[PDB]
Short mmCIF file of C-alpha atoms (C1' of nucleotides) and ligand atoms in Angstrom, two decimals:
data_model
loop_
_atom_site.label_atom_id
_atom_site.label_comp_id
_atom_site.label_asym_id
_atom_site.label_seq_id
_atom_site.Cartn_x
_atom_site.Cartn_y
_atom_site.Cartn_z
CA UNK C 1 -48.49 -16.49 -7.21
CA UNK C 2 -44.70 -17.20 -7.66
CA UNK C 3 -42.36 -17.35 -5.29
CA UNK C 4 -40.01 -14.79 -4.56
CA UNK C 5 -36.47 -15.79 -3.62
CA UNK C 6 -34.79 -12.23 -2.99
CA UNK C 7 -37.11 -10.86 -0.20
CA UNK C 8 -37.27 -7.26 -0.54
CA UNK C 9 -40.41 -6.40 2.38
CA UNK C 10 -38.09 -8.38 4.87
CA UNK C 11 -38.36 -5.91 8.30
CA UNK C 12 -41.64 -4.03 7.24
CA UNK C 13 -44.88 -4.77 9.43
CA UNK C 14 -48.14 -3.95 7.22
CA UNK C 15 -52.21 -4.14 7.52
CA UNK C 16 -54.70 -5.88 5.59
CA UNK C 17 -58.03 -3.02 5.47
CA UNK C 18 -60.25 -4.57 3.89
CA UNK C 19 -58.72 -7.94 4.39
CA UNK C 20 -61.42 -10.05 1.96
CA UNK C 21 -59.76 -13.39 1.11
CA UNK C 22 -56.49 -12.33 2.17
CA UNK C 23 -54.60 -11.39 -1.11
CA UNK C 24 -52.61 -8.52 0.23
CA UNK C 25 -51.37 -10.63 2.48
CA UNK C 26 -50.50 -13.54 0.51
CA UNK C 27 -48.41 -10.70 -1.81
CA UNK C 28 -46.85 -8.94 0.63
CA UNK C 29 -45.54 -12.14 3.02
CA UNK C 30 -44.01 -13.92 -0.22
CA UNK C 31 -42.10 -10.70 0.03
CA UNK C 32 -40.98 -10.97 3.22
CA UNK C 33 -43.53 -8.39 5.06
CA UNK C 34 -45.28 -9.26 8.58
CA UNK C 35 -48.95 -8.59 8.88
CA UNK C 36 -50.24 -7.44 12.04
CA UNK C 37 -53.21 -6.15 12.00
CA UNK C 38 -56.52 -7.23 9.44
CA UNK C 39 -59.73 -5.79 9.03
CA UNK C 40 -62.45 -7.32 6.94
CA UNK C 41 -66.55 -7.30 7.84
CA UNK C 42 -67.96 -10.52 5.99
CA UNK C 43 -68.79 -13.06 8.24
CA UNK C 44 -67.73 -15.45 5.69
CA UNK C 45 -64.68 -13.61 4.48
CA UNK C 46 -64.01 -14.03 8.06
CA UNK C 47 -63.81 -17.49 8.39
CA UNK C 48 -62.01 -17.97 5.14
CA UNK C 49 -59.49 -15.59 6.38
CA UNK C 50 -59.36 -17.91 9.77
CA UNK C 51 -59.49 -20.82 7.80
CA UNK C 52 -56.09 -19.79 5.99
CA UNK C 53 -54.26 -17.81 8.12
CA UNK C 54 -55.98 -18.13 11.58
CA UNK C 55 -56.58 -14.57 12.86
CA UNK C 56 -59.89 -13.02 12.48
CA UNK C 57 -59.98 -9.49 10.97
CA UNK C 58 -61.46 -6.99 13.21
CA UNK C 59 -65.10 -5.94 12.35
CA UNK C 60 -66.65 -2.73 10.24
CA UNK C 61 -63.60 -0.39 10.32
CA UNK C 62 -66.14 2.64 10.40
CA UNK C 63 -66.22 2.68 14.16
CA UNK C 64 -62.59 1.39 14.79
CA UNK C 65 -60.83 3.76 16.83
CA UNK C 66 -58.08 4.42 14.68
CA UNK C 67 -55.25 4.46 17.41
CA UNK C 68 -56.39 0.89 17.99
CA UNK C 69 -54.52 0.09 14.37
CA UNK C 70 -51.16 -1.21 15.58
CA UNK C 71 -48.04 0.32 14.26
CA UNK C 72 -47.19 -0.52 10.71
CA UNK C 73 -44.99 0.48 7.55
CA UNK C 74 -47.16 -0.16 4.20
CA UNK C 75 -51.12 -0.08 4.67
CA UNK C 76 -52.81 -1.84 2.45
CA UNK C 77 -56.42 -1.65 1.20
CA UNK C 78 -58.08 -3.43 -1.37
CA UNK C 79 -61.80 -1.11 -0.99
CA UNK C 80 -65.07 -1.49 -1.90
CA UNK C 81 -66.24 -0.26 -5.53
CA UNK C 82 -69.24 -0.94 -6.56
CA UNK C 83 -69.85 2.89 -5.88
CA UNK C 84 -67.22 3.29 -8.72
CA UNK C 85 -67.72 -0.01 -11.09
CA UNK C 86 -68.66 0.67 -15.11
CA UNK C 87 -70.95 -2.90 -13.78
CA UNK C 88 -72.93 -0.50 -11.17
CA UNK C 89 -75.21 3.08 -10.35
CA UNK C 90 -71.94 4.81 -10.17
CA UNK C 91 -72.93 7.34 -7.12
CA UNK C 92 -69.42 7.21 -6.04
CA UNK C 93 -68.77 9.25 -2.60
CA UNK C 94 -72.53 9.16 -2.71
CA UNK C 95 -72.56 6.12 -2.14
CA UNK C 96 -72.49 4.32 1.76
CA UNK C 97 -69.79 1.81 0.09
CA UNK C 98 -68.10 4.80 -1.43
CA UNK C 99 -66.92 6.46 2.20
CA UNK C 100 -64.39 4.00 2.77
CA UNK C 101 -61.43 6.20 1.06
CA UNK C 102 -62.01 8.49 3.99
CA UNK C 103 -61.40 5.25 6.42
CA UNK C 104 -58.36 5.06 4.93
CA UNK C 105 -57.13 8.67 5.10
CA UNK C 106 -58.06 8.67 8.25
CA UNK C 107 -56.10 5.70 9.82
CA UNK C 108 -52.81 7.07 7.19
CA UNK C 109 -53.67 10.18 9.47
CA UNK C 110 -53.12 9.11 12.61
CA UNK C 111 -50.62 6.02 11.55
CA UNK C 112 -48.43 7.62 8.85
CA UNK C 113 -47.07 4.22 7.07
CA UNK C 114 -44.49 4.46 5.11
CA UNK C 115 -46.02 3.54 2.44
CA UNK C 116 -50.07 3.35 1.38
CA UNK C 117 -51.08 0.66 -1.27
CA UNK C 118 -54.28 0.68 -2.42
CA UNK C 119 -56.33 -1.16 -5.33
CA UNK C 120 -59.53 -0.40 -7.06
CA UNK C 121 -61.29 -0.98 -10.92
CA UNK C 122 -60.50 0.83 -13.52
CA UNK C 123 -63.40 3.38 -13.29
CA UNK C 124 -62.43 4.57 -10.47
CA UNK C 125 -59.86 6.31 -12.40
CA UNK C 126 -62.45 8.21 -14.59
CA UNK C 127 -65.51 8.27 -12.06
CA UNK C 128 -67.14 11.75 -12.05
CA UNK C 129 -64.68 13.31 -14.71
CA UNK C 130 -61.74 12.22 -12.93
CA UNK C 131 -63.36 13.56 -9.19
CA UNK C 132 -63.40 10.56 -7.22
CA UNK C 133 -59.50 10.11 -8.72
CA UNK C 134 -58.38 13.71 -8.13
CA UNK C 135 -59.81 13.92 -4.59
CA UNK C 136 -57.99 10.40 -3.44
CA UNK C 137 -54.71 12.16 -5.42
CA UNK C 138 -55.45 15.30 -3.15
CA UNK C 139 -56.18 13.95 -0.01
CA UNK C 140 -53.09 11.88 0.09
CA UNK C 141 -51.05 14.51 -1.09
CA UNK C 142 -52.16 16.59 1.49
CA UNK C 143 -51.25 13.98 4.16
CA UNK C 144 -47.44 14.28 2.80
CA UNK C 145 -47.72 11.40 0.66
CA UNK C 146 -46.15 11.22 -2.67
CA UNK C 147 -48.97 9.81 -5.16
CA UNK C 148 -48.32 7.25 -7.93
CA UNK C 149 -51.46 5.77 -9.77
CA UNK C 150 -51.48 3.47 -12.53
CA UNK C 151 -53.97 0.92 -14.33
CA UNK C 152 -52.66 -2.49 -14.55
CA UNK C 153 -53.95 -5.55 -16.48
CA UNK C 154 -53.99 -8.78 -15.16
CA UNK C 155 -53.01 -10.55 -18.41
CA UNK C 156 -49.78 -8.46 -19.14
CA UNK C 157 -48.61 -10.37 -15.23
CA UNK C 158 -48.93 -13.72 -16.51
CA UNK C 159 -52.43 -14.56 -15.31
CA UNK C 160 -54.77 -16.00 -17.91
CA UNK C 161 -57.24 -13.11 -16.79
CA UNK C 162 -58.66 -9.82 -18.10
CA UNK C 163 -58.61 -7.59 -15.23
CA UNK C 164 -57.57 -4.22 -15.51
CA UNK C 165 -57.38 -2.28 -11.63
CA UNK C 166 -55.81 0.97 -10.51
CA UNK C 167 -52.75 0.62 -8.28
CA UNK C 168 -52.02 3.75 -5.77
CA UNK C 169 -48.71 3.33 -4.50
CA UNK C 170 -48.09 6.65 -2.12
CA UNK C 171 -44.99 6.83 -0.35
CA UNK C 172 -44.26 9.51 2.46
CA UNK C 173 -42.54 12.37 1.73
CA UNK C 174 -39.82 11.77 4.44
CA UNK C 175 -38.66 8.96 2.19
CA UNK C 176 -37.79 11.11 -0.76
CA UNK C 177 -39.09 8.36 -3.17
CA UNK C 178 -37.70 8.90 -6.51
CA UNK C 179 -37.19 5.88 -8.11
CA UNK C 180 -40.56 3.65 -7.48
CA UNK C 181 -41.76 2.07 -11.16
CA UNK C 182 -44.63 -0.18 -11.92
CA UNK C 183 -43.74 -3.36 -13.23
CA UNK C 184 -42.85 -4.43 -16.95
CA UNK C 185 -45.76 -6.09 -19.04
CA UNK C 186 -44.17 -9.34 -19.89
CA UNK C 187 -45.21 -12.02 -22.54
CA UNK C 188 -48.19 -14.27 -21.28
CA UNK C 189 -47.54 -17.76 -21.27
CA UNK C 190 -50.16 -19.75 -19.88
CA UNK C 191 -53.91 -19.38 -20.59
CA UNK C 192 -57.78 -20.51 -19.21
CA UNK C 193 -57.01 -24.42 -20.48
CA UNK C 194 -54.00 -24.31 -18.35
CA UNK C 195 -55.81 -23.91 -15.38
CA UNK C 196 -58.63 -26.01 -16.23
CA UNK C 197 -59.28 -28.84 -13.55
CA UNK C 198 -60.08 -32.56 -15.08
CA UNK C 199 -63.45 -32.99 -16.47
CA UNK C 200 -64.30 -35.17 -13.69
CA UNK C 201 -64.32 -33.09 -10.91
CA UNK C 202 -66.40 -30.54 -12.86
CA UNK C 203 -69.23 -32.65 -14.16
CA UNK C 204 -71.78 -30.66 -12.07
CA UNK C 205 -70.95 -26.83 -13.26
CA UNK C 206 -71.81 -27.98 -17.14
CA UNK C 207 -75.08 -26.07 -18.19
CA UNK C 208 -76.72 -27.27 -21.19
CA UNK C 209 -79.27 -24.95 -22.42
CA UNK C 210 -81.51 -24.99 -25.58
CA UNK C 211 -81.41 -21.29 -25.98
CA UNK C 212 -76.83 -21.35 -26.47
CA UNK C 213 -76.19 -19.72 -29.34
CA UNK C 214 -72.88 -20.27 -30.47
CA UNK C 215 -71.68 -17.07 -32.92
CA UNK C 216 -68.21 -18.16 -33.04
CA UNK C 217 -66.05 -20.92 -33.92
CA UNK C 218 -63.65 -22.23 -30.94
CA UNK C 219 -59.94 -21.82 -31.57
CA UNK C 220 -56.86 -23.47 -31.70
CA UNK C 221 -54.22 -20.86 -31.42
CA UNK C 222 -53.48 -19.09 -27.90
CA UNK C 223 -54.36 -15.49 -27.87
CA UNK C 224 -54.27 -13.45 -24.75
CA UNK C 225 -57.53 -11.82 -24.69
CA UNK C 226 -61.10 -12.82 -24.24
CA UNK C 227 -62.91 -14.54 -27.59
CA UNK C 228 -66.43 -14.53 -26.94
CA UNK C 229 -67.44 -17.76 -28.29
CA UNK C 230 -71.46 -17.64 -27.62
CA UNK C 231 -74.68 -16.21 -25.67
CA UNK C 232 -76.86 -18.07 -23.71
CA UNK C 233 -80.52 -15.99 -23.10
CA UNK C 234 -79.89 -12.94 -24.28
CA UNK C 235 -76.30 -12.53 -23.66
CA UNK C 236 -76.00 -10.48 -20.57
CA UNK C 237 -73.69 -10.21 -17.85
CA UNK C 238 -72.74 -13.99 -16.58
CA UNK C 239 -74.65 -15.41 -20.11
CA UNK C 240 -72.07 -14.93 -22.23
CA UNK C 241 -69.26 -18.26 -23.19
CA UNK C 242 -65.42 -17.81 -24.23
CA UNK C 243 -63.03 -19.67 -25.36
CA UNK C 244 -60.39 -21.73 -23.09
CA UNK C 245 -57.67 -20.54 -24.89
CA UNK C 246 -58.06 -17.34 -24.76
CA UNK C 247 -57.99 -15.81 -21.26
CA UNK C 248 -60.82 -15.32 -18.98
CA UNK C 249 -63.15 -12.31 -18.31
CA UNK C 250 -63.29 -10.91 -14.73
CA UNK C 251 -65.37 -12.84 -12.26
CA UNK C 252 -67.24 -10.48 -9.88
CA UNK C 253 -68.49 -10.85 -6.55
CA UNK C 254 -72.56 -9.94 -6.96
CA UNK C 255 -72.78 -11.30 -10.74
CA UNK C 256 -75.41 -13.19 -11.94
CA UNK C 257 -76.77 -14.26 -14.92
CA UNK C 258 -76.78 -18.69 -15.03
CA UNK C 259 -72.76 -18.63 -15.21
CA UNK C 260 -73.12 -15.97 -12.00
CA UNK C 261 -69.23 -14.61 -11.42
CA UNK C 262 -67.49 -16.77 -13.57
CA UNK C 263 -68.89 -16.06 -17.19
CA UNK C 264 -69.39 -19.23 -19.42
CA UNK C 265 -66.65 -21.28 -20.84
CA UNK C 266 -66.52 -24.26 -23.96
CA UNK C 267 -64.20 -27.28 -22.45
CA UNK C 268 -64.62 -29.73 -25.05
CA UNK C 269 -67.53 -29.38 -26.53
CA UNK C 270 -69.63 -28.47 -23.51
CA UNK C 271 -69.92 -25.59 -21.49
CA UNK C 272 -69.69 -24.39 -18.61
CA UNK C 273 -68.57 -22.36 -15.86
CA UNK C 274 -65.93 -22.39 -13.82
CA UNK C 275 -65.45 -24.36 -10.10
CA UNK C 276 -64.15 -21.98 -6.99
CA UNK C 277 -60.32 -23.65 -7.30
CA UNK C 278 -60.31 -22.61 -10.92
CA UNK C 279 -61.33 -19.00 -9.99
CA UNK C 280 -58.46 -19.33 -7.26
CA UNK C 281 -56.21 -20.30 -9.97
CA UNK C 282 -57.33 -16.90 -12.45
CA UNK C 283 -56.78 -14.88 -9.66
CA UNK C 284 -53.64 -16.40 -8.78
CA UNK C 285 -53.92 -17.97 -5.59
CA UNK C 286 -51.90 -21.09 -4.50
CA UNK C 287 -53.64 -24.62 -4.61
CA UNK C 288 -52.91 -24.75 -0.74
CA UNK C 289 -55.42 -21.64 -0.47
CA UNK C 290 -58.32 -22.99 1.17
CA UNK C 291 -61.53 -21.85 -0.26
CA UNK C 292 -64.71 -21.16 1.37
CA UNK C 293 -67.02 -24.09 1.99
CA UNK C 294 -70.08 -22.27 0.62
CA UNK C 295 -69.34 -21.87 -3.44
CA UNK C 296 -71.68 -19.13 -3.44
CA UNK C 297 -69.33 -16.97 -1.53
CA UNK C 298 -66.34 -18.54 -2.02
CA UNK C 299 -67.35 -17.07 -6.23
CA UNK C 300 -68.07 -13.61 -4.25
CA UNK C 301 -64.61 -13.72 -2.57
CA UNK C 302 -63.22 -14.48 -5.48
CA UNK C 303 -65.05 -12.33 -7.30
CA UNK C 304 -63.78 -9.11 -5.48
CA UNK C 305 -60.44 -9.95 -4.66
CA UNK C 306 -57.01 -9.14 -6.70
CA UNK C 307 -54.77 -11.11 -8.83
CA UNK C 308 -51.74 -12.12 -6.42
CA UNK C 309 -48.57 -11.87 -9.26
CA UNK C 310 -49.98 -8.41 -9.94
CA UNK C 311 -49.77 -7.15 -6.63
CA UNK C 312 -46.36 -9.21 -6.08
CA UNK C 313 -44.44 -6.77 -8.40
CA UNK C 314 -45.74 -4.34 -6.90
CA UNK C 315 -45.11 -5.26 -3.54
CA UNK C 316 -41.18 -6.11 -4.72
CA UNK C 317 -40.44 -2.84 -6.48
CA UNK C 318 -42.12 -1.13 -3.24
CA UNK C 319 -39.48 -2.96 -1.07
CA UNK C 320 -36.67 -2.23 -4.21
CA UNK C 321 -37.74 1.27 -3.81
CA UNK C 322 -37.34 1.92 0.06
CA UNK C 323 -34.42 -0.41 0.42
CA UNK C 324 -32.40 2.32 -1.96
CA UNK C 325 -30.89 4.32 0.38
CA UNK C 326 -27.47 5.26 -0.62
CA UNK C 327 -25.08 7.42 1.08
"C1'" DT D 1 -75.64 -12.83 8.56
"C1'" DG D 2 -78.43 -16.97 1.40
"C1'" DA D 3 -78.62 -19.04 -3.22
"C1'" DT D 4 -79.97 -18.20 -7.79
"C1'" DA D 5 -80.53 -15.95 -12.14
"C1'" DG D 6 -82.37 -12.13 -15.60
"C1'" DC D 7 -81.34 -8.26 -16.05
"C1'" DG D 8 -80.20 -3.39 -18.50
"C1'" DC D 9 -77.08 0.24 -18.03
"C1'" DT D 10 -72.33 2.43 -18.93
"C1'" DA D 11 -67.60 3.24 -20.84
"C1'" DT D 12 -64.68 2.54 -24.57
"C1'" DC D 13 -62.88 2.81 -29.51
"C1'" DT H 1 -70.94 4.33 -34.51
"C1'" DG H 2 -71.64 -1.43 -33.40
"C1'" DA H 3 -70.15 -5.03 -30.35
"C1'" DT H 4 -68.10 -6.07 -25.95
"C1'" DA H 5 -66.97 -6.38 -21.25
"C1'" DG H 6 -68.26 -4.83 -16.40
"C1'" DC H 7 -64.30 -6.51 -8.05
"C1'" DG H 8 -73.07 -4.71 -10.28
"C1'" DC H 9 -78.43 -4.57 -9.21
"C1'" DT H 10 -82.16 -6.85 -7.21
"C1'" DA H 11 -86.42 -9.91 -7.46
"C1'" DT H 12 -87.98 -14.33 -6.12
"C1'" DC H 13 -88.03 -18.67 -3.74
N1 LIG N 401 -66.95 -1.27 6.52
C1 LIG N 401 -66.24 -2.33 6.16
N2 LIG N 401 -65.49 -2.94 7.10
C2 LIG N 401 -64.78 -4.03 6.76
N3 LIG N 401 -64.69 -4.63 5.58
C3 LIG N 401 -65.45 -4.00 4.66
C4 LIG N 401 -66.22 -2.87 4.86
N4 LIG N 401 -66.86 -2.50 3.68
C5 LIG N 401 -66.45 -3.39 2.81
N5 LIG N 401 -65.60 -4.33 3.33
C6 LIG N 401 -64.96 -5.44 2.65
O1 LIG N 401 -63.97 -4.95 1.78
C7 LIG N 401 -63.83 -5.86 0.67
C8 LIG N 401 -63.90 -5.09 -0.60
S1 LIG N 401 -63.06 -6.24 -1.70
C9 LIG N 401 -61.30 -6.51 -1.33
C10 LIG N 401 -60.83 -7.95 -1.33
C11 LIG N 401 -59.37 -8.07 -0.90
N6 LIG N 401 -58.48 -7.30 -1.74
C12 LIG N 401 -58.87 -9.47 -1.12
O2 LIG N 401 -57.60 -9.55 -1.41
O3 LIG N 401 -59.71 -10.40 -1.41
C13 LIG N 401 -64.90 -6.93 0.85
O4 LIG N 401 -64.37 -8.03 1.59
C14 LIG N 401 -65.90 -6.24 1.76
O5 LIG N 401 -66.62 -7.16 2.54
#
DNA sequence: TGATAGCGCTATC
DNA sequence: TGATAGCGCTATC
């Protein structure tokens, strides 16, 4: 993340739905914001959300009475999408994971925040011909909310990541919104090798296999964008190596394959994948983020979570936004 | 409330 | 297309 000197979420109190590892919040409070209220069901998402910021997010929001949500100006929910990933079935509202829009509408209901941020892949943009998409656009709408979705890469932000997620920024009408604006792409300046922790603490996470086929050669010149350097197997999801200096792939939170979440990666001459602080690092979390003492799902929570700088941006030109109110 | 790893399909240009 | 990337799926221990 960066810091932010001129502190544009100052007054505003928001929640953390779907709390995970706590991005939102991170984002949001480096703008100023309070949080006062987080939800999150992972018992170990939990404790790593304890472990940094010592609350405990209230259990499955499902069967939260939504009057119980405390008062609040931005609502923020990062939810579930398998149900919607190009990486899954795809069975959408189908799906028991695919409900939780309807959690959301229904606490913006009976809450009416300000303003409703929410965060989900790519496909959720072009699930069922643009459904899934046009039903969130409508339902909001409908709840007197002004609707403003756009897909954002992580690697135009100045994260060394390729991670490309839908942002729905809905303000309420009362607000008269006019002038909210995603951020500018700027020029990427740092890259995977930046991030890269010494080879000694990451002895253990090389993988030497007979079957890695290396079809490229590594580079020397910084590009930002993923250069597939080799297969491992057969080449499938999580057995697939890039190139340091380009930047990395997504991780993802049920991956697998032998470099499970973090895809494969050449660091002189060997290769491997990549430790839980370098994942908090590509998803832009501070150093002083505590991660989760199990790597298995400290990779999940990574895995899932969002890219803080992204979501800073955001979370200024949200505060730019409502704090333009001219006579 | 688990850790690991081989999928095997889709969306995109 | 032809090659890649995907906050995934799911069997086995
Ligand atoms: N019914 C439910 N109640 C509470 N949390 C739920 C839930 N269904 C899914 N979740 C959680 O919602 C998250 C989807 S991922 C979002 C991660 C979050 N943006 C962060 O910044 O890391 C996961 O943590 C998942 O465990």
């Amino acid at each position: 993340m960066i810091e932010i000197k001129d502190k544009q979420l100052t007054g505003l109190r928001f929640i953390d739905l779907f709390a995970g590892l706590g991005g939102f919040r991170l984002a949001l409070e480096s703008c100023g914001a309070e949080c006062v209220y987080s939800n999150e069901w992972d018992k170990y998402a939990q404790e790593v959300y304890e472990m940094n910021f010592g609350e405990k997010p209230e259990g499955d929001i499902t069967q939260v009475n939504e009057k119980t949500i405390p008062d609040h100006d931005i609502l923020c929910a990062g939810f579930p999408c398998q149900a919607f990933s190009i990486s899954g079935k795809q069975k959408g509202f189908e799906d028991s994971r695919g409900t939780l829009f309807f959690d959301i509408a229904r606490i913006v209901r009976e809450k009416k925040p300000k303003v409703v941020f929410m965060e989900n892949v790519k496909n959720f943009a072009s699930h069922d011909n643009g459904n899934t998409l046009e039903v969130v656009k409508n339902t909001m709408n409908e709840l007197d909310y002004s609707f403003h979705a756009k897909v954002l890469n992580a690697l135009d932000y100045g994260i060394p990541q390729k991670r490309e997620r839908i942002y729905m920024i809905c303000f309420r009408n009362d607000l008269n919104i006019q002038n909210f604006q995603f951020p500018k792409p700027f020029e990427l300046n740092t890259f995977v090798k930046d991030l890269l922790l010494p080879d000694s603490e990451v002895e253990h996470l090389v993988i030497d296999r007979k079957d890695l086929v290396m079809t490229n050669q590594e580079i020397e010149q910084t590009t930002p964008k993923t250069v597939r350097l080799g297969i491992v197997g057969k080449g499938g999801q999580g057995e697939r190596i890039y190139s340091t200096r380009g930047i990395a792939i997504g991780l993802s939170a049920y991956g697998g394959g032998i470099f499970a979440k973090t895809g494969g990666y050449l660091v002189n001459g060997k290769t491997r994948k990549l430790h839980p602080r370098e994942c908090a690092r590509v998803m832009g979390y501070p150093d002083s983020y505590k991660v989760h003492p199990s790597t298995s799902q400290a990779y999940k929570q990574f895995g899932n979570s969002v890219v803080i700088n992204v979501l800073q941006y955001i979370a200024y030109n949200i505060g730019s936004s409502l704090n333009f109110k001219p006579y």
